[PDB]
Design a protein around this ligand. Sequence first.
Ligand SMILES: Nc1ncnc2c1ncn2[C@@H]1O[C@H](COS(=O)(=O)NC(=O)c2csc(-c3nc4ccc(O)cc4s3)n2)[C@@H](O)[C@H]1O
Ligand SMILES: [Mg+2]
Length: 538
Amino acid sequence: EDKNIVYGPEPFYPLEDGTAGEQLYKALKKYAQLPGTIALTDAHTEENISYAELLELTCRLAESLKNYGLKQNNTIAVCSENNLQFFIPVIAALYIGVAVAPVNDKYTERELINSLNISKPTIIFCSKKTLQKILQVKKKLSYIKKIIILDSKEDIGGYQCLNNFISQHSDANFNVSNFKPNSFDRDEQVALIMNSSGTTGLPKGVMLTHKNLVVRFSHCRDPIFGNQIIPGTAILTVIPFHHGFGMFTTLGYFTCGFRIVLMHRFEEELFLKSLQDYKVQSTLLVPTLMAFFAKSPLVDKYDLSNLKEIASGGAPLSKEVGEAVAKRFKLPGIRQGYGLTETTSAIIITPEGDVKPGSTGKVVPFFSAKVVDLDTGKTLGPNQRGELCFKGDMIMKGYVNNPEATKEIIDKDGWLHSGDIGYYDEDGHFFIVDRLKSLIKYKGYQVAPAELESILLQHPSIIDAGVTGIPDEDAGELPAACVVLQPGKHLTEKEVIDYVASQVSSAKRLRGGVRFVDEIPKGSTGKIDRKALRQILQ
Ligand SMILES: Nc1ncnc2c1ncn2[C@@H]1O[C@H](COS(=O)(=O)NC(=O)c2csc(-c3nc4ccc(O)cc4s3)n2)[C@@H](O)[C@H]1O
Ligand SMILES: [Mg+2]
């Protein structure tokens, strides 16, 4: 009952009033008043956008959009790789209550069409790289009335660039000082529309309101649950802005006044060189990169003494990998957050002063969590694996034009069934075991790939691993593993199999075998492509 529900503590300070756009405006103005403060920095080009510049461009774009005709609750879309201009339309739209629909720049035309069919945006801000595929899909979509190019200073083939759009729809000499964003109902007005397949079905549009965002803004500035770097510190993120993992970490970074160093593509040398050169103290990565930090010798070639806040998210992180990273960088521990697109941001975060190796942290302020038995549905106590369910102020309003799917993930009481298996210890630390759909069905057993992957990652010669089940007529699914080896080292199939067998019960053995590969098929936020693993392991 109530005794088994875990609640987040009170926020260090109460929730700030206003919309997400108002809090972002106040933050940009605030840091813009300090000389030399930089908001965005492209690691590839070394170009930067100061806070003053970002305030000018977001306020001028909000005015240009209002003059153009956009009203409250209209929708725009952003299809662009990570770059300096990405967040200009996001913040400008939040200023005036326009909903933002980020769309993966790597989407095929079919995927792009379905996502745009859900959000139905009036304006699509794209990049030079995505201009052509947008032009292709737009031919089929009547609702798209305008295309703006974010990273070009000149118009291309009859399509307008950001600077010329702003110049066309806003008067030069526009006083930014006097610009004020709109005030509206933050509990009802949608801020962003994110894409997620949820737990079953095809991709859907997740509606996140301004309230959900201001809650995240509270979190990210909380002395206990927020980033542990001071305003002006440099932070490097490799997460894509179009995903909630990147979107709601970076948007909070603006409210903290950090210098956000971004990359549109992870490259080991540019990544480490950027960390040293910008004296980065915080970095946001995925488990594969945590393994890189734990085992790559290249880490020793760069001055990373400034780095102290190393965060991971998006997928299960091996306990031992985290410990190895903390140890190598002589840190008390690492940072982690756990969330879903439907919960806007991370709902379980490692709090300040409270680390527990293997645990992704504790329930964040304004949230409650529970673990329910996968059979009886009943709540469970500490150290009992079940389906993690959540409830709180960052839960989505629902899926766009799809009440059914919303009722299929948010039950009648208000609990969001995440679809992940995990547990919580006696101190309230949560542990994510793995996604339910990822569990391997070996005879009457369900083996968690993350467990075997953690074992594989304990080996000094393995830098990455992906585990899934291969079809079998008698057993159903046989656990098998794809393994990425440390350059210069070698391992046989038998070595890996015996290494795992000596540590796990008979049901978890790698009966499907082992295939060595150059990389593990994974998504941009750490999601292991199980289907691709099976193809490889066949
Ligand atoms: N930390 C984690 N540990 C284990 N598993 C994790 C995980 N995060 C996501 N997952 C998995 O991705 C699934 C959700 O996928 S999803 O729909 O595409 N959405 C997401 O993965 C998602 C949305 S927000 C977000 C995070 N925000 C953060 C902010 C700060 C910080 O320090 C860490 C984080 S993680 N992750 C989860 O159900 C879960 O299975
Ligand atoms: Mg999703």
